[PDB]
Amino acid sequence: SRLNRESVIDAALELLNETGIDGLTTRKLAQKLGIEQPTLYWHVKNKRALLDALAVEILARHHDYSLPAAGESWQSFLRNNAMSFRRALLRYRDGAKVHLGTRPDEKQYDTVETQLRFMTENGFSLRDGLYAISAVSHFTLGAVLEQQEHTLPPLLREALQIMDSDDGEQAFLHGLESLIRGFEVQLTALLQIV
Amino acid sequence: SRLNRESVIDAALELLNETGIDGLTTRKLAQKLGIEQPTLYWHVKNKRALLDALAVEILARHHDYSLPAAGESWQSFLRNNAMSFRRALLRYRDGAKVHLGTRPDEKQYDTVETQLRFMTENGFSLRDGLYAISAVSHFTLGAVLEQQEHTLPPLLREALQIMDSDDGEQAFLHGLESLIRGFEVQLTALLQIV
Ligand SMILES: CN(C)[C@@H]1C(O)=C(C#N)C(=O)[C@@]2(O)C(=O)C[C@@H]([C@]3(C)OC(=O)c4c(O)ccc(Cl)c43)C[C@@H]12
Ligand SMILES: CN(C)[C@@H]1C(O)=C(C#N)C(=O)[C@@]2(O)C(=O)C[C@@H]([C@]3(C)OC(=O)c4c(O)ccc(Cl)c43)C[C@@H]12
Ligand SMILES: [Cl-]
Ligand SMILES: [Cl-]
Ligand SMILES: [Cl-]
Ligand SMILES: [Cl-]
C-alpha cells in the first residue's frame, strides 16, 4: 500500500489498537502494509523510531486543547488542558506508555513555551509555573496509566466499587481540582507564610 | 544456588538492576542462579508471576512508611507516605513500571484498609478519602515514571535546567504540597460552595 509518513502512522496506530505496545513490531507493521521488511526499513528504521513518531502524532491528532482561549483564566486553562491530555492518552491502547517513553518534539516545544509565557503573565514565576504544569502532567499521566493497566476488607470493598463503577474519570476530575486549588493557594500567598 | 522464595527474588531484583523490565527474562534469571530453565519453572512459572512477586517485594522491603504514627495528622501522613512510596519505586531500575503492571496483594489490602480507616477518622468520607489517596498515588507514580524514563525557546531553556539540576525531587515535593492543601480546602468546606 501507500508508504508516506501519514499512511505509515495510520497503519501503526491501528496496529497499536490490535497488539499493544509490547506486541507492536516493525515485522507486523510490514505485514499490515502489504510490504516486505526491508522496504519498511527505508521508511522507518526501528520500533523506537516508530514509537517516538507515534507519541508525537497521538498528541497532534487528538490533544486538541493545548493552548488557552482568549481571556481564559490560568485555572480554567490547566483544567481544559489536563482533560484534553487525558483523553488523547486514552484514545489508543497503551497510549500512556507510548507517550512516557519519548522526549518532546520541535512543535511540542513551542506549545509548552506559550504555556509557560501564559502562566508567567498570570503571575507565576517560571519555577512555580513549571512545577504547576509538571504536577498536572504527572498526575494525569499516572491516572491514565493506572486506568489503562487495570483494564477483602470492608471499606476497601466499598472503595474499589466506587472506583470501578466509573472508568476513573471522577477520581481524576476531583484530584485535578484539588491540585489547581493548591496552586491557587500557593500563588495568592506571595511571600506570606502559607 | 539456593532456590527458596527469598533467594529467587533477591536474584530477580539484582537482575532487574542489570537489565530493566523489558530485558528481564526467566532464562536469564536461571543463568544467574546457576540452574537449568525447567528447575526454575518448578519455582516460578513465568515472567508475569516473577513481576507480580517483585512488585509486592519492592514495597514490603522498602515502603517503610505505610502507616501513620501515633498522633499524626492526615496531612503529615499523606506526605510521609508519598515520600516513602516514591523512594521505594526509585530504588530499582524500572521500579515504577514493575509496580504499575500488578493488582494489589493480600497484605497490601490490610494496609490500604487501615489507611482508609485513618482518613475516615479524620473526617473524610470513604469517597473523598479514596480520591485523596488515589490522587497522591497517581501523582507519585507519574512523577517517578517520568524521572525513571528520562534517566529550543527561552523560558523552556531555563525551565528544563531547573528540572535537570535536580533529579525531580523539588518538583515532586512542591506538587505534593499543592495536592494536600487542595484536599484540606475541600475537606474544611463541608457542604459550603467552595
Ligand atoms: C499536559 N500539558 C500540561 C502539557 C502539554 O500541553 C503537552 C503537549 N502538547 C505535553 O507535552 C505535556 O503533556 C508533557 O508531558 C510534557 C510537559 C512538560 C512540562 O513540557 C516539557 O518540555 C517537559 C519535559 O521536558 C519534561 C517533563 C515535563 Cl512534565 C515536561 C507539558 C505537558
Ligand atoms: C501510596 N499510598 C497512598 C498507598 C500505599 O501505601 C500502598 C502500599 N503498600 C499502595 O499499594 C499504593 O501505593 C497503591 O498504588 C495503591 C493505592 C490504592 C488506593 O489502593 C488500592 O487497592 C488501589 C486500587 O485497587 C487501585 C488503584 C489505587 Cl491508587 C489503589 C494505595 C497506595
Ligand atoms: Cl495503495
Ligand atoms: Cl509509497
Ligand atoms: Cl548455595
Ligand atoms: Cl533450594
Side-chain angles (χ1 to χ4, degrees), chain A residues 135-149 151-159 161 163-179 181:
Chain A
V136 180
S137 303
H138 289 164
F139 172 60
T140 300
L141 182 55
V144 169
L145 279 159
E146 274 294 351
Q147 171 165 354
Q148 292 188 327
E149 215 73 351
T151 15
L152 264 198
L155 284 171
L156 225 44
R157 163 170 294 282
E158 161 68 270
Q161 279 275 31
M163 284 253 310
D164 153 56
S165 67
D166 187 33
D167 59 330
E169 223 212 352
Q170 285 155 21
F172 169 71
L173 290 175
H174 199 105
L176 189 51
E177 293 310 284
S178 292
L179 209 31
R181 183 52 57 92

mmCIF file of all heavy atoms in Angstrom, chain A residues 135-181, unseen atoms left out:
data_model
loop_
_atom_site.group_PDB
_atom_site.id
_atom_site.type_symbol
_atom_site.label_atom_id
_atom_site.label_comp_id
_atom_site.label_asym_id
_atom_site.label_seq_id
_atom_site.Cartn_x
_atom_site.Cartn_y
_atom_site.Cartn_z
ATOM 1 N N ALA A 135 3.135 19.016 37.619
ATOM 2 C CA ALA A 135 2.314 18.294 38.572
ATOM 3 C C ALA A 135 1.052 17.835 37.840
ATOM 4 O O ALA A 135 0.744 16.706 37.868
ATOM 5 C CB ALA A 135 1.976 19.156 39.735
ATOM 6 N N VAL A 136 0.428 18.720 37.080
ATOM 7 C CA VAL A 136 -0.703 18.379 36.291
ATOM 8 C C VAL A 136 -0.397 17.259 35.362
ATOM 9 O O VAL A 136 -1.157 16.243 35.376
ATOM 10 C CB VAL A 136 -1.301 19.578 35.564
ATOM 11 C CG1 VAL A 136 -2.504 19.138 34.742
ATOM 12 C CG2 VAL A 136 -1.720 20.574 36.561
ATOM 13 N N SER A 137 0.719 17.359 34.627
ATOM 14 C CA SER A 137 1.078 16.323 33.706
ATOM 15 C C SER A 137 1.347 15.002 34.361
ATOM 16 O O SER A 137 1.085 13.985 33.743
ATOM 17 C CB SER A 137 2.350 16.656 32.896
ATOM 18 O OG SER A 137 2.176 17.869 32.211
ATOM 19 N N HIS A 138 1.984 15.008 35.530
ATOM 20 C CA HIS A 138 2.432 13.785 36.170
ATOM 21 C C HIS A 138 1.182 13.064 36.782
ATOM 22 O O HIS A 138 0.989 11.897 36.575
ATOM 23 C CB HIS A 138 3.514 14.066 37.226
ATOM 24 C CG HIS A 138 4.845 14.486 36.644
ATOM 25 N ND1 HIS A 138 5.840 15.081 37.402
ATOM 26 C CD2 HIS A 138 5.351 14.374 35.394
ATOM 27 C CE1 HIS A 138 6.890 15.342 36.633
ATOM 28 N NE2 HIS A 138 6.626 14.908 35.413
ATOM 29 N N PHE A 139 0.320 13.828 37.440
ATOM 30 C CA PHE A 139 -0.937 13.351 37.948
ATOM 31 C C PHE A 139 -1.750 12.702 36.814
ATOM 32 O O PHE A 139 -2.201 11.603 36.942
ATOM 33 C CB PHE A 139 -1.696 14.503 38.623
ATOM 34 C CG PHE A 139 -3.098 14.131 39.006
ATOM 35 C CD1 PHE A 139 -3.317 13.087 39.886
ATOM 36 C CD2 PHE A 139 -4.152 14.689 38.391
ATOM 37 C CE1 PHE A 139 -4.574 12.672 40.182
ATOM 38 C CE2 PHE A 139 -5.428 14.288 38.706
ATOM 39 C CZ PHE A 139 -5.624 13.266 39.613
ATOM 40 N N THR A 140 -1.837 13.360 35.660
ATOM 41 C CA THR A 140 -2.690 12.899 34.591
ATOM 42 C C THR A 140 -2.100 11.643 34.027
ATOM 43 O O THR A 140 -2.811 10.641 33.825
ATOM 44 C CB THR A 140 -2.801 13.954 33.527
ATOM 45 O OG1 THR A 140 -3.366 15.112 34.125
ATOM 46 C CG2 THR A 140 -3.657 13.495 32.369
ATOM 47 N N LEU A 141 -0.795 11.679 33.765
ATOM 48 C CA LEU A 141 -0.130 10.509 33.226
ATOM 49 C C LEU A 141 -0.363 9.319 34.146
ATOM 50 O O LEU A 141 -0.715 8.240 33.690
ATOM 51 C CB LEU A 141 1.381 10.749 33.053
ATOM 52 C CG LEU A 141 2.278 9.665 32.466
ATOM 53 C CD1 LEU A 141 1.724 9.235 31.118
ATOM 54 C CD2 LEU A 141 3.695 10.208 32.247
ATOM 55 N N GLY A 142 -0.079 9.499 35.434
ATOM 56 C CA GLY A 142 -0.302 8.429 36.425
ATOM 57 C C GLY A 142 -1.752 7.921 36.469
ATOM 58 O O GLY A 142 -1.979 6.741 36.421
ATOM 59 N N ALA A 143 -2.731 8.805 36.519
ATOM 60 C CA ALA A 143 -4.137 8.357 36.496
ATOM 61 C C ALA A 143 -4.398 7.560 35.256
ATOM 62 O O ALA A 143 -4.904 6.478 35.367
ATOM 63 C CB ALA A 143 -5.073 9.469 36.598
ATOM 64 N N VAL A 144 -3.969 8.024 34.077
ATOM 65 C CA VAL A 144 -4.283 7.302 32.852
ATOM 66 C C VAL A 144 -3.561 5.993 32.791
ATOM 67 O O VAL A 144 -4.157 4.963 32.382
ATOM 68 C CB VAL A 144 -3.975 8.057 31.590
ATOM 69 C CG1 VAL A 144 -4.074 7.112 30.338
ATOM 70 C CG2 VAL A 144 -4.900 9.213 31.477
ATOM 71 N N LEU A 145 -2.300 5.970 33.221
ATOM 72 C CA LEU A 145 -1.563 4.689 33.187
ATOM 73 C C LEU A 145 -2.311 3.633 34.024
ATOM 74 O O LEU A 145 -2.479 2.513 33.597
ATOM 75 C CB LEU A 145 -0.118 4.843 33.650
ATOM 76 C CG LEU A 145 0.790 5.376 32.552
ATOM 77 C CD1 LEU A 145 2.113 6.030 33.109
ATOM 78 C CD2 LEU A 145 1.087 4.252 31.534
ATOM 79 N N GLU A 146 -2.795 4.022 35.193
ATOM 80 C CA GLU A 146 -3.481 3.096 36.088
ATOM 81 C C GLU A 146 -4.769 2.605 35.493
ATOM 82 O O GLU A 146 -5.038 1.408 35.512
ATOM 83 C CB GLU A 146 -3.753 3.734 37.450
ATOM 84 C CG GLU A 146 -2.571 3.596 38.438
ATOM 85 C CD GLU A 146 -2.302 2.148 38.841
ATOM 86 O OE1 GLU A 146 -3.137 1.262 38.503
ATOM 87 O OE2 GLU A 146 -1.270 1.886 39.521
ATOM 88 N N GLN A 147 -5.542 3.525 34.930
ATOM 89 C CA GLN A 147 -6.770 3.178 34.203
ATOM 90 C C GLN A 147 -6.518 2.182 33.057
ATOM 91 O O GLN A 147 -7.291 1.234 32.885
ATOM 92 C CB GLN A 147 -7.459 4.449 33.673
ATOM 93 C CG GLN A 147 -8.643 4.219 32.719
ATOM 94 C CD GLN A 147 -9.524 5.476 32.495
ATOM 95 O OE1 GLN A 147 -9.340 6.528 33.139
ATOM 96 N NE2 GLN A 147 -10.508 5.351 31.602
ATOM 97 N N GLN A 148 -5.454 2.399 32.285
ATOM 98 C CA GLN A 148 -5.176 1.576 31.136
ATOM 99 C C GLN A 148 -4.606 0.233 31.541
ATOM 100 O O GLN A 148 -4.734 -0.731 30.781
ATOM 101 C CB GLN A 148 -4.235 2.267 30.143
ATOM 102 C CG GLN A 148 -4.857 3.467 29.455
ATOM 103 C CD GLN A 148 -4.006 4.061 28.305
ATOM 104 O OE1 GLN A 148 -2.767 4.047 28.339
ATOM 105 N NE2 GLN A 148 -4.696 4.575 27.275
ATOM 106 N N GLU A 149 -3.992 0.121 32.711
ATOM 107 C CA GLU A 149 -3.428 -1.180 33.103
ATOM 108 C C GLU A 149 -4.538 -2.113 33.614
ATOM 109 O O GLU A 149 -4.770 -3.186 33.039
ATOM 110 C CB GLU A 149 -2.289 -1.018 34.107
ATOM 111 C CG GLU A 149 -1.141 -2.044 33.941
ATOM 112 C CD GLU A 149 -0.243 -1.827 32.726
ATOM 113 O OE1 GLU A 149 -0.585 -0.989 31.880
ATOM 114 O OE2 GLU A 149 0.812 -2.505 32.601
ATOM 115 N N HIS A 150 -5.241 -1.682 34.666
ATOM 116 C CA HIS A 150 -6.335 -2.452 35.255
ATOM 117 C C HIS A 150 -7.202 -3.029 34.146
ATOM 118 O O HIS A 150 -7.439 -4.247 34.100
ATOM 119 C CB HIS A 150 -7.179 -1.576 36.196
ATOM 120 N N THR A 151 -7.641 -2.169 33.226
ATOM 121 C CA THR A 151 -8.435 -2.604 32.063
ATOM 122 C C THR A 151 -7.879 -2.072 30.743
ATOM 123 O O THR A 151 -7.376 -2.854 29.926
ATOM 124 C CB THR A 151 -9.916 -2.184 32.228
ATOM 125 O OG1 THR A 151 -10.011 -1.194 33.276
ATOM 126 C CG2 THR A 151 -10.790 -3.420 32.569
ATOM 127 N N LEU A 152 -11.265 -9.830 50.872
ATOM 128 C CA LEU A 152 -11.154 -8.372 51.028
ATOM 129 C C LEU A 152 -11.575 -7.859 52.419
ATOM 130 O O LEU A 152 -12.183 -8.588 53.179
ATOM 131 C CB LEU A 152 -11.979 -7.641 49.955
ATOM 132 C CG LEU A 152 -11.244 -7.180 48.694
ATOM 133 C CD1 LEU A 152 -12.055 -6.101 47.954
ATOM 134 C CD2 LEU A 152 -9.832 -6.665 49.013
ATOM 135 N N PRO A 153 -11.224 -6.599 52.753
ATOM 136 C CA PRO A 153 -11.762 -5.891 53.926
ATOM 137 C C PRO A 153 -12.812 -4.795 53.576
ATOM 138 O O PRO A 153 -12.829 -4.300 52.447
ATOM 139 C CB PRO A 153 -10.497 -5.291 54.571
ATOM 140 C CG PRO A 153 -9.489 -5.103 53.403
ATOM 141 C CD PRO A 153 -10.041 -5.898 52.204
ATOM 142 N N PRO A 154 -13.679 -4.416 54.544
ATOM 143 C CA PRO A 154 -14.929 -3.663 54.288
ATOM 144 C C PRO A 154 -14.810 -2.375 53.486
ATOM 145 O O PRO A 154 -15.349 -2.277 52.379
ATOM 146 C CB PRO A 154 -15.436 -3.311 55.692
ATOM 147 C CG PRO A 154 -14.707 -4.196 56.626
ATOM 148 C CD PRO A 154 -13.413 -4.560 55.992
ATOM 149 N N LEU A 155 -14.116 -1.390 54.061
ATOM 150 C CA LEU A 155 -14.006 -0.047 53.475
ATOM 151 C C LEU A 155 -13.450 -0.096 52.044
ATOM 152 O O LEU A 155 -13.964 0.566 51.133
ATOM 153 C CB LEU A 155 -13.148 0.844 54.378
ATOM 154 C CG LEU A 155 -13.875 1.324 55.630
ATOM 155 C CD1 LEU A 155 -12.936 2.023 56.640
ATOM 156 C CD2 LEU A 155 -15.003 2.263 55.207
ATOM 157 N N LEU A 156 -12.433 -0.931 51.869
ATOM 158 C CA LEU A 156 -11.863 -1.208 50.574
ATOM 159 C C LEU A 156 -12.948 -1.747 49.663
ATOM 160 O O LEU A 156 -13.247 -1.140 48.640
ATOM 161 C CB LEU A 156 -10.704 -2.210 50.689
ATOM 162 C CG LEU A 156 -9.434 -1.889 49.888
ATOM 163 C CD1 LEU A 156 -9.044 -0.418 50.010
ATOM 164 C CD2 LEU A 156 -8.285 -2.762 50.370
ATOM 165 N N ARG A 157 -13.557 -2.865 50.061
ATOM 166 C CA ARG A 157 -14.638 -3.476 49.295
ATOM 167 C C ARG A 157 -15.565 -2.383 48.739
ATOM 168 O O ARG A 157 -15.776 -2.324 47.523
ATOM 169 C CB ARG A 157 -15.357 -4.549 50.153
ATOM 170 C CG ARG A 157 -16.734 -5.022 49.695
ATOM 171 C CD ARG A 157 -17.211 -6.267 50.523
ATOM 172 N NE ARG A 157 -16.377 -7.456 50.278
ATOM 173 C CZ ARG A 157 -16.457 -8.257 49.204
ATOM 174 N NH1 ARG A 157 -17.352 -8.034 48.241
ATOM 175 N NH2 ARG A 157 -15.630 -9.301 49.085
ATOM 176 N N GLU A 158 -16.070 -1.496 49.597
ATOM 177 C CA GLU A 158 -16.896 -0.383 49.119
ATOM 178 C C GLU A 158 -16.048 0.600 48.274
ATOM 179 O O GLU A 158 -16.524 1.138 47.269
ATOM 180 C CB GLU A 158 -17.631 0.311 50.279
ATOM 181 C CG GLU A 158 -18.159 1.740 49.986
ATOM 182 C CD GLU A 158 -19.308 1.819 48.959
ATOM 183 O OE1 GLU A 158 -19.024 1.956 47.745
ATOM 184 O OE2 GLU A 158 -20.497 1.792 49.371
ATOM 185 N N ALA A 159 -14.794 0.816 48.669
ATOM 186 C CA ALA A 159 -13.867 1.674 47.917
ATOM 187 C C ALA A 159 -13.725 1.257 46.450
ATOM 188 O O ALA A 159 -14.049 2.025 45.539
ATOM 189 C CB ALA A 159 -12.492 1.681 48.587
ATOM 190 N N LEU A 160 -13.242 0.036 46.239
ATOM 191 C CA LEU A 160 -12.973 -0.489 44.907
ATOM 192 C C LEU A 160 -14.247 -0.780 44.056
ATOM 193 O O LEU A 160 -14.147 -1.318 42.931
ATOM 194 C CB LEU A 160 -12.095 -1.741 45.020
ATOM 195 C CG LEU A 160 -10.719 -1.513 45.645
ATOM 196 N N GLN A 161 -15.429 -0.422 44.575
ATOM 197 C CA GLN A 161 -16.665 -0.410 43.765
ATOM 198 C C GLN A 161 -17.007 1.009 43.278
ATOM 199 O O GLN A 161 -17.595 1.164 42.202
ATOM 200 C CB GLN A 161 -17.859 -1.024 44.530
ATOM 201 C CG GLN A 161 -17.924 -2.580 44.513
ATOM 202 C CD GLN A 161 -18.631 -3.180 43.267
ATOM 203 O OE1 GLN A 161 -18.593 -2.610 42.172
ATOM 204 N NE2 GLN A 161 -19.262 -4.343 43.447
ATOM 205 N N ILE A 162 -16.653 2.034 44.051
ATOM 206 C CA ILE A 162 -16.842 3.414 43.586
ATOM 207 C C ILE A 162 -15.759 3.797 42.575
ATOM 208 O O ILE A 162 -15.937 4.766 41.851
ATOM 209 C CB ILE A 162 -16.825 4.499 44.719
ATOM 210 C CG1 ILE A 162 -17.438 3.999 46.031
ATOM 211 C CG2 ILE A 162 -17.552 5.769 44.246
ATOM 212 N N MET A 163 -14.640 3.065 42.552
ATOM 213 C CA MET A 163 -13.551 3.316 41.577
ATOM 214 C C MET A 163 -13.809 2.527 40.299
ATOM 215 O O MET A 163 -13.353 2.943 39.231
ATOM 216 C CB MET A 163 -12.151 2.962 42.140
ATOM 217 C CG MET A 163 -11.542 3.987 43.151
ATOM 218 S SD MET A 163 -10.142 5.093 42.649
ATOM 219 C CE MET A 163 -8.998 3.884 41.939
ATOM 220 N N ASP A 164 -14.543 1.407 40.408
ATOM 221 C CA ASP A 164 -14.886 0.549 39.252
ATOM 222 C C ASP A 164 -16.164 0.991 38.511
ATOM 223 O O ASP A 164 -16.195 0.970 37.267
ATOM 224 C CB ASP A 164 -15.024 -0.919 39.687
ATOM 225 C CG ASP A 164 -15.966 -1.725 38.778
ATOM 226 O OD1 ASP A 164 -15.721 -1.771 37.535
ATOM 227 O OD2 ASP A 164 -16.951 -2.304 39.309
ATOM 228 N N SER A 165 -17.211 1.359 39.264
ATOM 229 C CA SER A 165 -18.476 1.918 38.705
ATOM 230 C C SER A 165 -18.251 2.916 37.563
ATOM 231 O O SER A 165 -19.132 3.152 36.730
ATOM 232 C CB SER A 165 -19.301 2.616 39.813
ATOM 233 O OG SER A 165 -18.663 3.802 40.311
ATOM 234 N N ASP A 166 -17.058 3.506 37.562
ATOM 235 C CA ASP A 166 -16.649 4.508 36.607
ATOM 236 C C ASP A 166 -15.360 4.002 35.986
ATOM 237 O O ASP A 166 -14.769 3.048 36.478
ATOM 238 C CB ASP A 166 -16.406 5.793 37.411
ATOM 239 C CG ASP A 166 -16.127 7.011 36.552
ATOM 240 O OD1 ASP A 166 -16.670 7.150 35.425
ATOM 241 O OD2 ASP A 166 -15.377 7.851 37.052
ATOM 242 N N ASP A 167 -14.906 4.657 34.926
ATOM 243 C CA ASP A 167 -13.633 4.320 34.319
ATOM 244 C C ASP A 167 -12.405 5.035 34.959
ATOM 245 O O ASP A 167 -11.280 4.807 34.531
ATOM 246 C CB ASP A 167 -13.698 4.627 32.832
ATOM 247 C CG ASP A 167 -14.019 6.092 32.555
ATOM 248 O OD1 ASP A 167 -14.720 6.717 33.401
ATOM 249 O OD2 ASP A 167 -13.560 6.604 31.499
ATOM 250 N N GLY A 168 -12.615 5.869 35.976
ATOM 251 C CA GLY A 168 -11.535 6.599 36.618
ATOM 252 C C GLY A 168 -11.720 8.096 36.496
ATOM 253 O O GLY A 168 -11.019 8.852 37.166
ATOM 254 N N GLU A 169 -12.680 8.519 35.673
ATOM 255 C CA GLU A 169 -12.887 9.936 35.381
ATOM 256 C C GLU A 169 -13.214 10.814 36.611
ATOM 257 O O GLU A 169 -12.675 11.911 36.746
ATOM 258 C CB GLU A 169 -13.991 10.127 34.342
ATOM 259 C CG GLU A 169 -13.620 11.178 33.272
ATOM 260 C CD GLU A 169 -14.798 11.959 32.713
ATOM 261 O OE1 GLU A 169 -15.971 11.601 33.027
ATOM 262 O OE2 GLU A 169 -14.538 12.946 31.966
ATOM 263 N N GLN A 170 -14.108 10.328 37.490
ATOM 264 C CA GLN A 170 -14.484 11.065 38.697
ATOM 265 C C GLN A 170 -13.316 11.243 39.610
ATOM 266 O O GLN A 170 -13.110 12.302 40.099
ATOM 267 C CB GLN A 170 -15.606 10.353 39.481
ATOM 268 C CG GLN A 170 -16.970 10.487 38.858
ATOM 269 C CD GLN A 170 -17.951 9.341 39.220
ATOM 270 O OE1 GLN A 170 -17.785 8.624 40.237
ATOM 271 N NE2 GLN A 170 -18.997 9.187 38.383
ATOM 272 N N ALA A 171 -12.590 10.189 39.891
ATOM 273 C CA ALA A 171 -11.428 10.283 40.732
ATOM 274 C C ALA A 171 -10.422 11.301 40.152
ATOM 275 O O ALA A 171 -9.841 12.062 40.903
ATOM 276 C CB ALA A 171 -10.759 8.931 40.882
ATOM 277 N N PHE A 172 -10.258 11.282 38.829
ATOM 278 C CA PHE A 172 -9.340 12.163 38.151
ATOM 279 C C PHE A 172 -9.787 13.601 38.275
ATOM 280 O O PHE A 172 -8.980 14.445 38.633
ATOM 281 C CB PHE A 172 -9.219 11.814 36.683
ATOM 282 C CG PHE A 172 -8.516 12.809 35.898
ATOM 283 C CD1 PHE A 172 -7.137 12.977 36.038
ATOM 284 C CD2 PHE A 172 -9.202 13.580 34.994
ATOM 285 C CE1 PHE A 172 -6.463 13.876 35.294
ATOM 286 C CE2 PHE A 172 -8.536 14.531 34.256
ATOM 287 C CZ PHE A 172 -7.141 14.667 34.397
ATOM 288 N N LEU A 173 -11.064 13.864 38.013
ATOM 289 C CA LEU A 173 -11.539 15.249 37.948
ATOM 290 C C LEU A 173 -11.557 15.915 39.333
ATOM 291 O O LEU A 173 -11.301 17.116 39.483
ATOM 292 C CB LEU A 173 -12.933 15.311 37.316
ATOM 293 C CG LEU A 173 -13.026 15.011 35.840
ATOM 294 C CD1 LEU A 173 -14.531 14.992 35.385
ATOM 295 C CD2 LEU A 173 -12.172 15.975 34.949
ATOM 296 N N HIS A 174 -11.845 15.122 40.349
ATOM 297 C CA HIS A 174 -11.767 15.592 41.722
ATOM 298 C C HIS A 174 -10.324 15.943 42.081
ATOM 299 O O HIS A 174 -10.047 17.034 42.546
ATOM 300 C CB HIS A 174 -12.325 14.518 42.665
ATOM 301 C CG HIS A 174 -12.713 15.019 44.028
ATOM 302 N ND1 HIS A 174 -14.034 15.195 44.415
ATOM 303 C CD2 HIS A 174 -11.963 15.279 45.124
ATOM 304 C CE1 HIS A 174 -14.068 15.606 45.669
ATOM 305 N NE2 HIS A 174 -12.822 15.676 46.119
ATOM 306 N N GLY A 175 -9.395 15.026 41.881
ATOM 307 C CA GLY A 175 -7.963 15.295 42.152
ATOM 308 C C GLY A 175 -7.417 16.469 41.323
ATOM 309 O O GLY A 175 -6.689 17.280 41.819
ATOM 310 N N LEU A 176 -7.808 16.585 40.077
ATOM 311 C CA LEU A 176 -7.484 17.761 39.279
ATOM 312 C C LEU A 176 -7.806 19.037 40.025
ATOM 313 O O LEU A 176 -6.938 19.906 40.177
ATOM 314 C CB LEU A 176 -8.237 17.728 37.966
ATOM 315 C CG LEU A 176 -7.837 18.770 36.936
ATOM 316 C CD1 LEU A 176 -6.264 18.760 36.711
ATOM 317 C CD2 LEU A 176 -8.618 18.529 35.619
ATOM 318 N N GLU A 177 -9.035 19.145 40.544
ATOM 319 C CA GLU A 177 -9.461 20.340 41.285
ATOM 320 C C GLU A 177 -8.701 20.598 42.539
ATOM 321 O O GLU A 177 -8.556 21.749 42.931
ATOM 322 C CB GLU A 177 -10.939 20.281 41.691
ATOM 323 C CG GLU A 177 -11.915 20.339 40.540
ATOM 324 C CD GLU A 177 -11.633 21.470 39.616
ATOM 325 O OE1 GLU A 177 -11.936 22.626 39.945
ATOM 326 O OE2 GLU A 177 -11.135 21.168 38.530
ATOM 327 N N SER A 178 -8.319 19.543 43.229
ATOM 328 C CA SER A 178 -7.565 19.695 44.448
ATOM 329 C C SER A 178 -6.181 20.289 44.106
ATOM 330 O O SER A 178 -5.692 21.185 44.756
ATOM 331 C CB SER A 178 -7.405 18.360 45.141
ATOM 332 O OG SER A 178 -8.659 17.867 45.631
ATOM 333 N N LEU A 179 -5.591 19.801 43.025
ATOM 334 C CA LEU A 179 -4.296 20.254 42.584
ATOM 335 C C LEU A 179 -4.362 21.755 42.223
ATOM 336 O O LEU A 179 -3.529 22.520 42.681
ATOM 337 C CB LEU A 179 -3.871 19.434 41.397
ATOM 338 C CG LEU A 179 -2.423 19.158 41.053
ATOM 339 C CD1 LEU A 179 -1.540 19.099 42.254
ATOM 340 C CD2 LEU A 179 -2.440 17.828 40.283
ATOM 341 N N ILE A 180 -5.356 22.161 41.419
ATOM 342 C CA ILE A 180 -5.453 23.554 40.943
ATOM 343 C C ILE A 180 -5.659 24.496 42.120
ATOM 344 O O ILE A 180 -5.070 25.567 42.178
ATOM 345 C CB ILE A 180 -6.574 23.743 39.948
ATOM 346 C CG1 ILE A 180 -6.172 23.083 38.633
ATOM 347 C CG2 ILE A 180 -6.869 25.177 39.729
ATOM 348 N N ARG A 181 -6.520 24.114 43.052
ATOM 349 C CA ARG A 181 -6.751 24.957 44.241
ATOM 350 C C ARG A 181 -5.484 25.118 45.068
ATOM 351 O O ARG A 181 -5.260 26.176 45.659
ATOM 352 C CB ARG A 181 -7.839 24.399 45.135
ATOM 353 C CG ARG A 181 -8.199 25.240 46.368
ATOM 354 C CD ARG A 181 -8.538 26.739 46.088
ATOM 355 N NE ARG A 181 -9.638 26.912 45.147
ATOM 356 C CZ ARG A 181 -10.928 27.036 45.473
ATOM 357 N NH1 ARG A 181 -11.318 27.041 46.742
ATOM 358 N NH2 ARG A 181 -11.835 27.171 44.511
#
